[PDB]
mmCIF file of N, CA and C in Angstrom:
data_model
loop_
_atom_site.group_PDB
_atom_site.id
_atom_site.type_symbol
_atom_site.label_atom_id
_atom_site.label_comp_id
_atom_site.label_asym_id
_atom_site.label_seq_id
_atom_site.Cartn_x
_atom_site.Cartn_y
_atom_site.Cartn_z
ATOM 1 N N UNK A 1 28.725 28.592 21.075
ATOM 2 C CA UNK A 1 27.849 27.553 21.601
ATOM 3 C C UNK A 1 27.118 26.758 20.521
ATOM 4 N N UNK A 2 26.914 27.286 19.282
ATOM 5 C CA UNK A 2 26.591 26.612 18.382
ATOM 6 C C UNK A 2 26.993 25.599 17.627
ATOM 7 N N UNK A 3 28.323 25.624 18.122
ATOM 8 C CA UNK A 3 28.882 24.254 17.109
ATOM 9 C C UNK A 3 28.825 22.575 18.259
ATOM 10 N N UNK A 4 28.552 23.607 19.458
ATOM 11 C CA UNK A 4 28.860 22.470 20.610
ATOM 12 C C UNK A 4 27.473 21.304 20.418
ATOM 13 N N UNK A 5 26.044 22.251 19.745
ATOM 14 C CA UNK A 5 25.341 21.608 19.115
ATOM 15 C C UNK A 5 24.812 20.942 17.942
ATOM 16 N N UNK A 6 25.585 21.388 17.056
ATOM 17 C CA UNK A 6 25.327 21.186 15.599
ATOM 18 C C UNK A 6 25.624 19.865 15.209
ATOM 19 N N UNK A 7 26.736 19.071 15.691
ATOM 20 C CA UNK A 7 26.813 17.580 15.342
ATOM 21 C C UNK A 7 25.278 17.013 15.831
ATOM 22 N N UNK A 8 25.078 16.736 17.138
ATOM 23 C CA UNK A 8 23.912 16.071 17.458
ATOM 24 C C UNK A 8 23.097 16.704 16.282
ATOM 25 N N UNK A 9 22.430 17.839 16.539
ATOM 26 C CA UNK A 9 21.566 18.049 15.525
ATOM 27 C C UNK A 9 21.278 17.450 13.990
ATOM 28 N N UNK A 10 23.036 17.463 13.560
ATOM 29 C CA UNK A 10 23.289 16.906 12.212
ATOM 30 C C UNK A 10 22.562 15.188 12.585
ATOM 31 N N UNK A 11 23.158 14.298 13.358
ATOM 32 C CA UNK A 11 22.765 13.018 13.848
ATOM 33 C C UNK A 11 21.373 13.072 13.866
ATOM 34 N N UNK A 12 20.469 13.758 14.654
ATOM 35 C CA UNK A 12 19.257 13.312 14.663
ATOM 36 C C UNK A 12 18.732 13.588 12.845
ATOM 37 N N UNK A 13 18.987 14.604 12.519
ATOM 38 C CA UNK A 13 18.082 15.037 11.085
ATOM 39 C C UNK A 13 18.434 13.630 10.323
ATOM 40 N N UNK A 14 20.097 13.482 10.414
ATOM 41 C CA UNK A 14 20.209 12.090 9.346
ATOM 42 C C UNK A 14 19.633 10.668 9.817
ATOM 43 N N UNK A 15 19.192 10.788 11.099
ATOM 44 C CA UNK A 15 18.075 9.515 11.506
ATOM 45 C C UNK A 15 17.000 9.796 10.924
ATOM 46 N N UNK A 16 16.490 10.967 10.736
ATOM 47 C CA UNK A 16 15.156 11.348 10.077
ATOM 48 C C UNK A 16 14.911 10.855 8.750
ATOM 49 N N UNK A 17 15.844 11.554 8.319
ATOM 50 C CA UNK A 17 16.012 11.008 6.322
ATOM 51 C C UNK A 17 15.836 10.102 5.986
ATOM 52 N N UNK A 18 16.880 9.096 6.844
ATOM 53 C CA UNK A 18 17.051 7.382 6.120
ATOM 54 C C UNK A 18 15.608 7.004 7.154
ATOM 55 N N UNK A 19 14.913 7.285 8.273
ATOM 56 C CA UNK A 19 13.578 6.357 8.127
ATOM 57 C C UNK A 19 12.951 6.819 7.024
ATOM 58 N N UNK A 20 12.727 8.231 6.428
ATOM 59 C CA UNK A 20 11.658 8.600 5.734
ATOM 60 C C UNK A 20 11.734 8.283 4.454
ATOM 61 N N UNK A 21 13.610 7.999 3.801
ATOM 62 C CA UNK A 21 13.484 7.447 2.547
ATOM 63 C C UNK A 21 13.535 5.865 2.640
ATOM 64 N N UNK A 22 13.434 5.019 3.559
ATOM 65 C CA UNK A 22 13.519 3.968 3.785
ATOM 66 C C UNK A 22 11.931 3.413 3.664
ATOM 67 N N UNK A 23 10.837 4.589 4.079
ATOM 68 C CA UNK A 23 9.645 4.141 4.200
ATOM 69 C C UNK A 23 8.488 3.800 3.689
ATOM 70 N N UNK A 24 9.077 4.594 2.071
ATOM 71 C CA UNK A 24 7.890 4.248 1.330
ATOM 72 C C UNK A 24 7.952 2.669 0.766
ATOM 73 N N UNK A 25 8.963 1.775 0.852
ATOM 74 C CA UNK A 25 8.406 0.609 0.182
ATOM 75 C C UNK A 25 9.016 -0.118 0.883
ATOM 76 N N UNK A 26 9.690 -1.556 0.630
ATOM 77 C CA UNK A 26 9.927 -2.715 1.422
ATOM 78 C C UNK A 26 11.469 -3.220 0.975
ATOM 79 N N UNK A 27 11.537 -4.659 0.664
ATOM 80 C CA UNK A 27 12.900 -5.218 0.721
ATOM 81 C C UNK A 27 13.576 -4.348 0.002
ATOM 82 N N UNK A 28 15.046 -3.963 -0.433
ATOM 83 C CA UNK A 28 15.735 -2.971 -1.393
ATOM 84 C C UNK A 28 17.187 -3.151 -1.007
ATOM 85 N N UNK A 29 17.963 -3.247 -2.363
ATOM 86 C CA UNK A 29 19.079 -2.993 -2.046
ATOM 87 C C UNK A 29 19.759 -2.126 -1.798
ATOM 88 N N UNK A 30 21.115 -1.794 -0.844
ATOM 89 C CA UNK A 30 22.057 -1.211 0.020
ATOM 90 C C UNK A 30 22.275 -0.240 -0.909
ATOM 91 N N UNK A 31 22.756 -0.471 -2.404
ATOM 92 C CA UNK A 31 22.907 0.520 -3.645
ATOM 93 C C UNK A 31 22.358 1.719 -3.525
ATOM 94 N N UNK A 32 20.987 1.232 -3.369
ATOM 95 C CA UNK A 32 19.982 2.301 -3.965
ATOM 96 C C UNK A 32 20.056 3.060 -2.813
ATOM 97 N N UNK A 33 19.979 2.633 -1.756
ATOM 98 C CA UNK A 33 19.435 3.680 -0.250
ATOM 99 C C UNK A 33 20.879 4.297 -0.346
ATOM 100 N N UNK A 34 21.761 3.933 0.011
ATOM 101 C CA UNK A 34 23.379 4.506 -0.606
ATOM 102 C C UNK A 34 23.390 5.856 -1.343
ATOM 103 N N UNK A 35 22.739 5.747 -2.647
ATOM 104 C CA UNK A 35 22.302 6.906 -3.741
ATOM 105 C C UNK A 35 21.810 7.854 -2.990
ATOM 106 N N UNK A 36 20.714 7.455 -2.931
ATOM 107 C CA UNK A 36 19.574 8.014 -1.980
ATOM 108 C C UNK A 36 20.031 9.093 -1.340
ATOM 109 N N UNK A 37 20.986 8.392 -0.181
ATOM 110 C CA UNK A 37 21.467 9.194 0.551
ATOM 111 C C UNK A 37 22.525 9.457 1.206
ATOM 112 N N UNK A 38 23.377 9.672 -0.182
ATOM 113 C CA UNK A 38 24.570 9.835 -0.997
ATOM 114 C C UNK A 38 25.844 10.180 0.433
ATOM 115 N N UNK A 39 25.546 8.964 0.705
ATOM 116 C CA UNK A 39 26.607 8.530 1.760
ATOM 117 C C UNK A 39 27.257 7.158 1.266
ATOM 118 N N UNK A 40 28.175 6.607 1.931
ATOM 119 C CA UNK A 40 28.847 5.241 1.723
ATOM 120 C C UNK A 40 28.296 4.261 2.054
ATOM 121 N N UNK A 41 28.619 2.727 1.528
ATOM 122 C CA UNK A 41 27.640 1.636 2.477
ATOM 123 C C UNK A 41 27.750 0.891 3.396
ATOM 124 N N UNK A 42 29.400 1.150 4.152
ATOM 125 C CA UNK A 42 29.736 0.401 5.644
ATOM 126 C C UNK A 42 28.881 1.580 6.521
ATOM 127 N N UNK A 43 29.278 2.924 6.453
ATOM 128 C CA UNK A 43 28.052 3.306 7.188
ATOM 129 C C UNK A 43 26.795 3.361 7.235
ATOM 130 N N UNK A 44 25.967 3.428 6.333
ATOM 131 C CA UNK A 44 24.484 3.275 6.222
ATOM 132 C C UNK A 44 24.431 2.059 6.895
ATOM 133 N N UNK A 45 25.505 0.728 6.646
ATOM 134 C CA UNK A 45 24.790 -1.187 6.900
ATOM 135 C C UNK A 45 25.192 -0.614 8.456
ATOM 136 N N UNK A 46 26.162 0.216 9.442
ATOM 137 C CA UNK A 46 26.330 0.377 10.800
ATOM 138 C C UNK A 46 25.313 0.674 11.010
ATOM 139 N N UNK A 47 24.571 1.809 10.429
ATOM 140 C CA UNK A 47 23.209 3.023 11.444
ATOM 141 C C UNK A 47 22.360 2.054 11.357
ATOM 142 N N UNK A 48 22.007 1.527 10.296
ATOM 143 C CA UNK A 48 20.905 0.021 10.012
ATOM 144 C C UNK A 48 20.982 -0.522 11.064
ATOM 145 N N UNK A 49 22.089 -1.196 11.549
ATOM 146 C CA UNK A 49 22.142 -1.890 12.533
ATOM 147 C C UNK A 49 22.375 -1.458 13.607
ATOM 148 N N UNK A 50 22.257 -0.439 14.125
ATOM 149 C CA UNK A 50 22.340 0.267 15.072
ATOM 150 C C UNK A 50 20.905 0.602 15.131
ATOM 151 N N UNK A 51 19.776 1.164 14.387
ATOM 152 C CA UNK A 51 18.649 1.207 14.632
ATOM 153 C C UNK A 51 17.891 -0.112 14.822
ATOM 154 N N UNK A 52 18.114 -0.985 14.269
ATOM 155 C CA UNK A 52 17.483 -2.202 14.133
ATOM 156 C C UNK A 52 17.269 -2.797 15.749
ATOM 157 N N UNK A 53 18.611 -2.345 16.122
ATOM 158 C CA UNK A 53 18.861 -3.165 17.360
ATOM 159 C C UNK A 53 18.333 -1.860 18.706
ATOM 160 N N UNK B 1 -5.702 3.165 -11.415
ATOM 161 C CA UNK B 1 -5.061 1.364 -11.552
ATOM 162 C C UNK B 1 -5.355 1.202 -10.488
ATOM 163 N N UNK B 2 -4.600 1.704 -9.188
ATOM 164 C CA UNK B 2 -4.986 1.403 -7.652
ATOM 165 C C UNK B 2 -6.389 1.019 -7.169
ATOM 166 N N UNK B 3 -7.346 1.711 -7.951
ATOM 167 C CA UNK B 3 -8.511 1.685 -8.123
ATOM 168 C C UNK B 3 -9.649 -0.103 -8.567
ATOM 169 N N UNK B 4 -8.492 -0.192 -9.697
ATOM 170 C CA UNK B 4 -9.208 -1.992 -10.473
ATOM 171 C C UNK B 4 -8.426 -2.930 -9.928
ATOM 172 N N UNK B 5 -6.795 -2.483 -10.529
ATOM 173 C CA UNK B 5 -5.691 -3.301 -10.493
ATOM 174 C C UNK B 5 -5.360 -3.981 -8.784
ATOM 175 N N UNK B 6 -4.964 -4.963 -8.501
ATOM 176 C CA UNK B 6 -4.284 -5.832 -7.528
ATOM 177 C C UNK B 6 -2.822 -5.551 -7.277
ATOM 178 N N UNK B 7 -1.854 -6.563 -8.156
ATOM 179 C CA UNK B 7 -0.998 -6.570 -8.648
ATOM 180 C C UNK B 7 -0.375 -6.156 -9.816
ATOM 181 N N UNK B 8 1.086 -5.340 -10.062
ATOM 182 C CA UNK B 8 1.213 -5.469 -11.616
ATOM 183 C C UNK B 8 2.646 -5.050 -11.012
ATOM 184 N N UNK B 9 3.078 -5.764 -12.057
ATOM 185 C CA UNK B 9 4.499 -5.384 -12.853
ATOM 186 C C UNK B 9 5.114 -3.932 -13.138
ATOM 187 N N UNK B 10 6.555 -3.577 -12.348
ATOM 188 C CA UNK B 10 6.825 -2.282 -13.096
ATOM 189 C C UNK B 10 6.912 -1.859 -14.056
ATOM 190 N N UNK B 11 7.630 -2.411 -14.812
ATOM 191 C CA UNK B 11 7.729 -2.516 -16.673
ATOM 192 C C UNK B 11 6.813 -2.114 -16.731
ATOM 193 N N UNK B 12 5.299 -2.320 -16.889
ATOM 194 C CA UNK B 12 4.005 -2.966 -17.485
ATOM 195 C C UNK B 12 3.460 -1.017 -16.912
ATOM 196 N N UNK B 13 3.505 -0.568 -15.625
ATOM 197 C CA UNK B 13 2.723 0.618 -15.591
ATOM 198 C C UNK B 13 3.597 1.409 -15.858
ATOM 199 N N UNK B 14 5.174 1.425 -15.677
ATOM 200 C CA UNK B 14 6.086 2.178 -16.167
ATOM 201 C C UNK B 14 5.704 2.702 -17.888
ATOM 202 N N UNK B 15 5.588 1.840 -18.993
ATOM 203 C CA UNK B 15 4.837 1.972 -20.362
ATOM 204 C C UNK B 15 4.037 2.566 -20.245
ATOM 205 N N UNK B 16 2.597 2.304 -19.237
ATOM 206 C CA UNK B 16 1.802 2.980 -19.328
ATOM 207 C C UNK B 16 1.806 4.571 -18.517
ATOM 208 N N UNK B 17 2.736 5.060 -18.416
ATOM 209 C CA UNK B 17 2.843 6.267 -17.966
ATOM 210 C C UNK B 17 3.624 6.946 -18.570
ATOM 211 N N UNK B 18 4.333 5.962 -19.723
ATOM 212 C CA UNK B 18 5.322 6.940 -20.868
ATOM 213 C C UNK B 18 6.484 7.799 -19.831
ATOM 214 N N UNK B 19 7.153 6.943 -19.109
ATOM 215 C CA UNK B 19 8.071 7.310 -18.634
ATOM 216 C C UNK B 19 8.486 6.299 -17.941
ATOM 217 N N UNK B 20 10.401 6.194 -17.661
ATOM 218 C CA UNK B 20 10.928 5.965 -16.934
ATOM 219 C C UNK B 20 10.690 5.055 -16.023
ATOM 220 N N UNK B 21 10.940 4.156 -15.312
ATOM 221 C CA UNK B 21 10.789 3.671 -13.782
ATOM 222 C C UNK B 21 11.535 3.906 -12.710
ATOM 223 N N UNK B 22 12.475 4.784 -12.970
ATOM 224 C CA UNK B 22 13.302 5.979 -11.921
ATOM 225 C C UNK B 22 11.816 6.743 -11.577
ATOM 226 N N UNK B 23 11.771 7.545 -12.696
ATOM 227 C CA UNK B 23 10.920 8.340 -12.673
ATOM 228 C C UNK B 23 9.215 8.074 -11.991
ATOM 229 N N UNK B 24 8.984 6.611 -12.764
ATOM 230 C CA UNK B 24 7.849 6.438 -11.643
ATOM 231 C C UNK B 24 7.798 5.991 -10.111
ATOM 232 N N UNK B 25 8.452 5.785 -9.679
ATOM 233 C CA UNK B 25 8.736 5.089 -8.208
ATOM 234 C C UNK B 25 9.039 6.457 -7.632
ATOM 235 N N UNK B 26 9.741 7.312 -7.930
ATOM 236 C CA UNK B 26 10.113 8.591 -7.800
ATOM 237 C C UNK B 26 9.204 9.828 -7.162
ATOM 238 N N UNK B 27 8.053 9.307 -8.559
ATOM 239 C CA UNK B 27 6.589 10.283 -8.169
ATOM 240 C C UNK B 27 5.719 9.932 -7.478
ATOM 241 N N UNK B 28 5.630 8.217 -7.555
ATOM 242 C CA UNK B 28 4.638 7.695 -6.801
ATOM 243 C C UNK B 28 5.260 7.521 -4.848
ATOM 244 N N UNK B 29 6.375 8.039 -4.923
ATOM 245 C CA UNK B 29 6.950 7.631 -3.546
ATOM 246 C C UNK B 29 6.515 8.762 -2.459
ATOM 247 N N UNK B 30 6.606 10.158 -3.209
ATOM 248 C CA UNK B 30 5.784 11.201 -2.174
ATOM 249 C C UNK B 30 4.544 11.237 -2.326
ATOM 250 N N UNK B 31 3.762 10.239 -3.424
ATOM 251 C CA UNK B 31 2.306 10.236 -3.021
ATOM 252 C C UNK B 31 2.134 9.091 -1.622
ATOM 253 N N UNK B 32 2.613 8.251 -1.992
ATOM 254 C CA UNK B 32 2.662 7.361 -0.445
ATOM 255 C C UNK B 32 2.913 7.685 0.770
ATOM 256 N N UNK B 33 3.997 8.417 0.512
ATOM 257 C CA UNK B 33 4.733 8.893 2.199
ATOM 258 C C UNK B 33 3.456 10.259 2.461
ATOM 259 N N UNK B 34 2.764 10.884 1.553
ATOM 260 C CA UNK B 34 1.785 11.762 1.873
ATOM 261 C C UNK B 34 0.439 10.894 1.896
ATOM 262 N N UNK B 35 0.536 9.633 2.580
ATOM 263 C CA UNK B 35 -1.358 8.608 2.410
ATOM 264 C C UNK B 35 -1.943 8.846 1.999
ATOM 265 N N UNK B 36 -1.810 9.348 0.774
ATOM 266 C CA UNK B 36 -3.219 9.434 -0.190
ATOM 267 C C UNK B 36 -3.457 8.088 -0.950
ATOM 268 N N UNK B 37 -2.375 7.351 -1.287
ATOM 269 C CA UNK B 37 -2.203 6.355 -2.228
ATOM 270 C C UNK B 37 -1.481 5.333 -1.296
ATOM 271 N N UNK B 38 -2.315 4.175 -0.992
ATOM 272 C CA UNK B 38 -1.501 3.101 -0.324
ATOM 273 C C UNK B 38 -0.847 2.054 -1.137
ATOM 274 N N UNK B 39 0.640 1.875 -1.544
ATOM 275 C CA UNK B 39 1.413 0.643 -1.721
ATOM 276 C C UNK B 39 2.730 0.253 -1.857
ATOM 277 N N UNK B 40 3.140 -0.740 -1.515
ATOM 278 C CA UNK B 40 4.307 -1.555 -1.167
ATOM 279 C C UNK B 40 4.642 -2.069 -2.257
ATOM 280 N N UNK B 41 6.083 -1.184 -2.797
ATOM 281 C CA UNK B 41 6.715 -1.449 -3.776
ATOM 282 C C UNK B 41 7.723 -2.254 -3.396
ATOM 283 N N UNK B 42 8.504 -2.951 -4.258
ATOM 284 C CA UNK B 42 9.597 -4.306 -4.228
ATOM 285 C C UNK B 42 10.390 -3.777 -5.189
ATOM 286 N N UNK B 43 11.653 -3.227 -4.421
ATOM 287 C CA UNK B 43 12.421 -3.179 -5.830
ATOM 288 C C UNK B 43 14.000 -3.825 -5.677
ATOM 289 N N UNK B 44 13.328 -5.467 -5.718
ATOM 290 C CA UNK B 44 14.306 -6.382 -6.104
ATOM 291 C C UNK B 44 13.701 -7.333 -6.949
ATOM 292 N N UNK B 45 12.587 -7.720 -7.712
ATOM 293 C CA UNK B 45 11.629 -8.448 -7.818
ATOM 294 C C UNK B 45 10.631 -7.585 -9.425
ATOM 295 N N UNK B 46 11.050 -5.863 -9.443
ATOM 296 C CA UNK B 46 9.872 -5.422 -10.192
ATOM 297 C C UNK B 46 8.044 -5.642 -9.711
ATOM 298 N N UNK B 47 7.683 -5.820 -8.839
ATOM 299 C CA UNK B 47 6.472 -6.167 -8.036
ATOM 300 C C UNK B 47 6.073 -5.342 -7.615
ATOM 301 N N UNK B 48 5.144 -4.605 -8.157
ATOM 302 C CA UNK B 48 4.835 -3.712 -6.947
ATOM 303 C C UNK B 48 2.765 -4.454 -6.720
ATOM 304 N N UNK B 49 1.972 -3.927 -5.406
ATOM 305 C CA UNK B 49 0.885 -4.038 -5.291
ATOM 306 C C UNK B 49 0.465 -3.243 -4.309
ATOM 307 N N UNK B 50 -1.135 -3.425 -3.943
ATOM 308 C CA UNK B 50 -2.027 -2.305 -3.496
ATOM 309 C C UNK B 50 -2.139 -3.720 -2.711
ATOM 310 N N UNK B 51 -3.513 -3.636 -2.535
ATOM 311 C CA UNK B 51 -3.970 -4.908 -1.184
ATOM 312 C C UNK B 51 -3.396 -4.922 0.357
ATOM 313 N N UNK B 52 -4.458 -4.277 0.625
ATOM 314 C CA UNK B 52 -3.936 -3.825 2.448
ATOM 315 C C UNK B 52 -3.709 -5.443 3.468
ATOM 316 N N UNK B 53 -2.576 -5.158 4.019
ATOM 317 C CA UNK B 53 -2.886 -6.834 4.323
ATOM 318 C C UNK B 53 -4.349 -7.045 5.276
ATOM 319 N N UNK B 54 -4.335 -8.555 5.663
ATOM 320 C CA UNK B 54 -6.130 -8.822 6.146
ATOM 321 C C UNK B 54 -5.980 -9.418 7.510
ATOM 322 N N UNK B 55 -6.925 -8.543 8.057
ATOM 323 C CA UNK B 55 -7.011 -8.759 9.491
ATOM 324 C C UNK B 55 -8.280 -9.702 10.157
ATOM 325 N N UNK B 56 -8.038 -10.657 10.635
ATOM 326 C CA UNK B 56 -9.063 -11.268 11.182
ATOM 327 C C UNK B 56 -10.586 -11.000 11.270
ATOM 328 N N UNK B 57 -10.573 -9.721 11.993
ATOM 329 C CA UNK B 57 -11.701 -9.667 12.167
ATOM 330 C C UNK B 57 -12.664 -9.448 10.752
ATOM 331 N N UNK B 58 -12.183 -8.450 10.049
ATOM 332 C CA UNK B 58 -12.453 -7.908 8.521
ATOM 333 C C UNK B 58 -13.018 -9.376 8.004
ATOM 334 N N UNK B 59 -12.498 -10.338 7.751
ATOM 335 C CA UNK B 59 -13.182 -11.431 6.788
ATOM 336 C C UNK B 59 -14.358 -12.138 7.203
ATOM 337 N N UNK B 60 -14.584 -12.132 8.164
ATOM 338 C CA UNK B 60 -16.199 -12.711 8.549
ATOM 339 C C UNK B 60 -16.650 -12.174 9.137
ATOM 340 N N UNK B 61 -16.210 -10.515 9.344
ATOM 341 C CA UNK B 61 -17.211 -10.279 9.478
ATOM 342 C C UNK B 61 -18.026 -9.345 7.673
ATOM 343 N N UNK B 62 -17.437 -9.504 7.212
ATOM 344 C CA UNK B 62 -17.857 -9.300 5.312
ATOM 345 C C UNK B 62 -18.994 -10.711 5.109
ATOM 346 N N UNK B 63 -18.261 -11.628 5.907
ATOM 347 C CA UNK B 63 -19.045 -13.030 5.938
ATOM 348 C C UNK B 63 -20.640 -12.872 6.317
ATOM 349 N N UNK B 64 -20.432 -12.197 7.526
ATOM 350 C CA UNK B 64 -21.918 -11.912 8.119
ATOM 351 C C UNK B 64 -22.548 -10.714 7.264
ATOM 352 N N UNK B 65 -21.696 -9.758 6.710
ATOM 353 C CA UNK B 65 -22.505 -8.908 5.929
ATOM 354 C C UNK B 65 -23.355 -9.414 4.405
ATOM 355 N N UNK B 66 -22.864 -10.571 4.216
ATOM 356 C CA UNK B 66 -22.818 -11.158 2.999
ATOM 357 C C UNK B 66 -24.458 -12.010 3.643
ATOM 358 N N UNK B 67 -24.114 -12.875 4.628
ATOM 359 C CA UNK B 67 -25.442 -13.469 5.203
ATOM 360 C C UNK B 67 -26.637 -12.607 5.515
ATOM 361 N N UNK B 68 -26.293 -11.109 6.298
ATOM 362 C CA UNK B 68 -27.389 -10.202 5.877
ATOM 363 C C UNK B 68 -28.187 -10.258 5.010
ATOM 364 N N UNK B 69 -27.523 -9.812 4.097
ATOM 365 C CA UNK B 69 -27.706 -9.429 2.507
ATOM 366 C C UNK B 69 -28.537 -10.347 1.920
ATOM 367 N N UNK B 70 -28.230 -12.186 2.272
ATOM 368 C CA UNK B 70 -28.619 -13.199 1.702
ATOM 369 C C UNK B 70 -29.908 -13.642 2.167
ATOM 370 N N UNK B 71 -30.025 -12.885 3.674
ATOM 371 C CA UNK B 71 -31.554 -13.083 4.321
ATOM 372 C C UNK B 71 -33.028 -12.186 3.683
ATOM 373 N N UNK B 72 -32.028 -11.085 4.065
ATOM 374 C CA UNK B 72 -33.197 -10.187 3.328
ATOM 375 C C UNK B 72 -33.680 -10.129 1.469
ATOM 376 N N UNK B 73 -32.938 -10.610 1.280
ATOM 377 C CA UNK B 73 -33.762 -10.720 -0.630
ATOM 378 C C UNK B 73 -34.090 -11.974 -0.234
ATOM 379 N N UNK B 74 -34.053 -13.318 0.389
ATOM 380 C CA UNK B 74 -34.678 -14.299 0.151
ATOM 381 C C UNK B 74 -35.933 -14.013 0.975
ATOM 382 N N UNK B 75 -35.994 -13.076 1.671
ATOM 383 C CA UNK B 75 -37.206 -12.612 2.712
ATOM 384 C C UNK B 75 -38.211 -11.679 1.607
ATOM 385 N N UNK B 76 -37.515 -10.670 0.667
ATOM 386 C CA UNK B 76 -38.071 -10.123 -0.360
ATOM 387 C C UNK B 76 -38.816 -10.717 -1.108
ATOM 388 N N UNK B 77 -38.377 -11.972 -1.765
ATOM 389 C CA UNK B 77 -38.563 -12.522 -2.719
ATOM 390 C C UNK B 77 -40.357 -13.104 -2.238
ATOM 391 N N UNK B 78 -40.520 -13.325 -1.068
ATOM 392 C CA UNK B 78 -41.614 -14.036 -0.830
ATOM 393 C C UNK B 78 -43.046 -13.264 -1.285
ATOM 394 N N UNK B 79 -43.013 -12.356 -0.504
ATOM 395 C CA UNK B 79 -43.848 -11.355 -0.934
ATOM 396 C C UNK B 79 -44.406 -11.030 -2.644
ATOM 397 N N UNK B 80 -43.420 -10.700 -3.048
ATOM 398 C CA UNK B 80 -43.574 -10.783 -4.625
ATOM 399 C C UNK B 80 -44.180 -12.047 -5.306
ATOM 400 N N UNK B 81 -43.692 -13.072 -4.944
ATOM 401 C CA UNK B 81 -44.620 -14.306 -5.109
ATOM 402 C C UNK B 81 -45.463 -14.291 -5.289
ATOM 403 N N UNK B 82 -46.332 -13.949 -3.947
ATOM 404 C CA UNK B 82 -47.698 -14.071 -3.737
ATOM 405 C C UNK B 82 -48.499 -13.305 -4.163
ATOM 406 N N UNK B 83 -48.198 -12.086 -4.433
ATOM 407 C CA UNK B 83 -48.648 -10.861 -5.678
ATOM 408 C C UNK B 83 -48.694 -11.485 -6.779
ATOM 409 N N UNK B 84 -47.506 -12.205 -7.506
ATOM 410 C CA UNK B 84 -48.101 -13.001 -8.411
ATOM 411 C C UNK B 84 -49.150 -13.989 -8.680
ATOM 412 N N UNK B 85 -48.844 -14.917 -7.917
ATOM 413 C CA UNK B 85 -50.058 -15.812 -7.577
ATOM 414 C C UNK B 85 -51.275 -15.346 -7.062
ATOM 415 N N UNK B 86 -51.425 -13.552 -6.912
ATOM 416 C CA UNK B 86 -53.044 -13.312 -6.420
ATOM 417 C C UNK B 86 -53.802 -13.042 -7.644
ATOM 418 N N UNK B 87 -53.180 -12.341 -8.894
ATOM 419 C CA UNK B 87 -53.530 -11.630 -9.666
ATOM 420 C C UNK B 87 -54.000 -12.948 -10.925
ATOM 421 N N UNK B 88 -53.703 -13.865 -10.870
ATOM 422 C CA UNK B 88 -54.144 -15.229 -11.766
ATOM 423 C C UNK B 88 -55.113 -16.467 -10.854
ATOM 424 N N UNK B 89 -54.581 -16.884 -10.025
ATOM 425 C CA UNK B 89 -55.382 -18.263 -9.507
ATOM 426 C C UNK B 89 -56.486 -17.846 -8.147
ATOM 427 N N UNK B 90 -56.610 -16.510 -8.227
ATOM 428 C CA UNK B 90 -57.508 -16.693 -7.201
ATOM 429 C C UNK B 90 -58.943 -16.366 -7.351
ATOM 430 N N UNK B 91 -59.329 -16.132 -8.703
ATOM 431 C CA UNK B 91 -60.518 -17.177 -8.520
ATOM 432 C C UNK B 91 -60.841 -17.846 -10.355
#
């Protein structure tokens, strides 16, 4: 039963991260948040825009 | 700095901390996200600043605290005057 939950779980924590490293400052490029959070940048610019909206 | 300073340049406090600007944005980023230290860094620009933005009400009414302020010492001032002027011209 545990794995039937563990994706969602994974999903919400990585919504957590990118607001909290997103939050301490303002305009920034895709690069850096990328590093950050050492994922790729067609997905990070999707979740962006998927939260945005 | 947060303390005097407004505005400044990363370069410029980066030197003055003898380190890095990885390194300072780095340290100063969990003092922010923990509110002890309020400011909005720019890092496309090198800009960073303090200055909370300003809300309507905040500026006049500093205005009226300022007119307070400006009533009562010109209300002070009278008194003292006339202490002066008792101790010479009256008789």
């Amino acid at each position: 039963i545990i794995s039937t939950h563990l994706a969602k779980l994974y999903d919400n924590l990585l919504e957590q991260n990118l607001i909290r490293v997103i939050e301490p400052f303002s305009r920034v490029q895709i690069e850096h948040i990328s590093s950050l959070i050492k994922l790729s940048k067609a997905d990070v610019e999707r979740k962006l825009s998927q939260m945005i909206l | 700095m947060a303390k005097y300073y407004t505005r400044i340049t990363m370069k410029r406090m980066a030197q003055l901390l003898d380190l890095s600007v990885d390194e300072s944005e780095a340290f100063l980023s969990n003092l922010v996200v923990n509110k002890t230290i309020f400011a909005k860094v720019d890092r496309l620009a090198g800009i960073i600043n303090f200055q909370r933005p300003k809300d309507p009400n905040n500026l006049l009414n500093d205005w009226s605290q300022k007119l307070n302020s400006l009533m009562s010492l010109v209300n002070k001032t009278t008194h003292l005057i006339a202490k002066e002027e008792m101790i010479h011209n009256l008789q």
